[PDB]
Structure formats: C-alpha cells, structure tokens
Design a protein around this ligand. Structure first.
Ligand SMILES: [Zn+2]
Ligand SMILES: [Zn+2]
Length: 79
C-alpha cells in the first residue's frame, strides 16, 4: 500500500508494491513469467530477463546459470 504506479500495468498499486527492476510492480500483475504463478512478496521468486521467475523456475536453470540470472535481480530487481 505505498501508492506507487505498478510499472507492470502503469496503474496505482492496488496492493503491495513489489519493487522489481527498481520499479514498482503490482502483486496482481507481477507473476512468474515462466509459470504464470502470481508473484507475492511472501512467495519465493527472482528477476530474470527483466521478468519475474518463481524460485522453482530459477532452479530449472543450470546451477552455473541461475547464479548468472540472479546477478540480474541483484541490480535489476529490488532497487
Ligand atoms: Zn499493476
Ligand atoms: Zn516459474
């Protein structure tokens, strides 16, 4: 309930602002782009290719690749 505009839909956050890619994302719009699983600050997820990825998908990548994809969310994720 901060009041940011979920860059995912460009509309005022209707729930919690999921800071992704340093932008504000709706918990309703932000969803594992690899599973369509609704993303929530309580659920486990990561940023990949500028898209959300559930921890299960982040695990579907080779151990040496996930550490590289996680490198994205580290700077292109929560701020
Ligand atoms: Zn939204
Ligand atoms: Zn997934």
């Amino acid at each position: 309930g901060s009041g940011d505009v979920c860059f995912h839909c460009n509309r005022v956050i209707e729930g919690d602002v999921v800071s992704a890619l340093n932008k504000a994302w709706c918990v309703n719009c932000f969803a594992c782009s690899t599973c369509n699983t609704k993303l929530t600050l309580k659920n486990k997820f990561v940023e990949f290719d500028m898209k959300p990825v559930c921890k299960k998908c982040y695990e579907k990548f080779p151990l040496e690749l996930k550490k590289r994809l996680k490198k994205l969310a580290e700077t292109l994720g929560r701020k």
